[PDB]
Amino acid sequence: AEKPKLHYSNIRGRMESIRWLLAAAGVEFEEKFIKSAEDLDKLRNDGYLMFQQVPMVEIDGMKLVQTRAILNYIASKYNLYGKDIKEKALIDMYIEGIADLGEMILLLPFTQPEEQDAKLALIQEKTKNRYFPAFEKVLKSHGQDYLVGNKLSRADIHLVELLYYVEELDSSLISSFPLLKALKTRISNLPTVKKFLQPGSPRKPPMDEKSLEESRKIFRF
């Protein structure tokens, strides 16, 4: 038909969780890579960015900005946001938990090199001492395979995405957390998620020196 169109640079950044979520719902999409500050300026000058920033997603006849606005729409549309307002409330509480950790991780590669040790240390402590216990507690409490309502929701996808990033930063962090380890395998084995994990998918690589410099120019810092 008309595929969702993703407006971002060729990095993870704030678009990566939208990619995951779209792939987990079986949704094929297109990416229009911003390659320069001039490209970003175009979308601004045209009036397509309500707050002058990307991510912007063209979907279902709307140009959506703001990551949470985009992710909420996809999750509602593709039934990954709970069956009722009470499940939705548990989903929202958990994913906001996930985003707390998610944001520290996203910001890490853009931090000054004379800060990166302490920031990762802060991710280490929060992850082991607080956030991983919270999610393990949830799974232990119901003994079910999904976070909410005994059914795949966005929270499983958001948490597993995050597990792959935690995995890369410090592989020991998940070690004392068995149900988290098992959630990760089971979700990785879902057909849609299995496909996105394959080489050549729109799953993006971690930041490196070259993209960091690309980003400096595009986003002007």
Site residues (vs ligand ASD, CB under 6 A) = 13-14, 106-107, 110-111, 215, 219, 221
Omega of the bond prior to 55 within 30 degrees of 0, cis? yes
**Side chain identity, residue 108:** L
Site for its own copies in 120-179 (CB under 8 A): 130-131, 134
Q: Which of 32, 42, 68, 194 binds its own copies (CB under 8 A)?
A: 68
Please give the helix or strand (H or E) that residue 95 lies within, else none: helix 85-107
The one segment of 24-32, 73-81, 179-187, 204-212 that binds its own copies by CB under 8 A = 73-81
Known binding residue 53? Answer is: yes
Nearer to ligand ASD, 13 or 149 (CB): 13
Tell me the C-alpha distance between 7 and 44, whole Å.
Answer: 12
Known binding residue 166? Answer is: no
Which listed option, its own copies, ligand ASD, none, makes contact with residue 14 (CB within 5 to 8 Å by class)? Answer: ligand ASD
Residues 6+ apart with CB under 8 A from 119: 104, 107, 108, 111
Residues 6+ apart with CB under 8 A from 84: none
DSSP secondary structure, 1-67, as one string? ----EEEE-SS-TTTHHHHHHHHHTT---EEEE--SHHHHHHHHHTT--TTS-S-EEEETTEEEESH
Q: Does 96 bind its own copies (CB under 8 A)?
A: yes
The one segment of 16-24, 66-74, 107-115, 160-168 that binds its own copies by CB under 8 A = 66-74
Q: How distant, in Å, are the alpha carbons of 9, 36, 94, 103, 153 from that of 145?
A: 35, 43, 15, 26, 11
- Site track for its own copies across 1-40, x = CB under 8 A: ----------------------------------------
Minimal distance, residue 213 CB to its own copies, in Å:
25
Chain residues in the site for its own copies (CB under 8 A): 50-52, 60, 62, 64-69, 72-73, 76-77, 85-86, 88-90, 92-94, 96-97, 100, 130-131, 134
Which residue positions form the known binding site for glutathione?
A: 8, 44, 53-54, 66-67
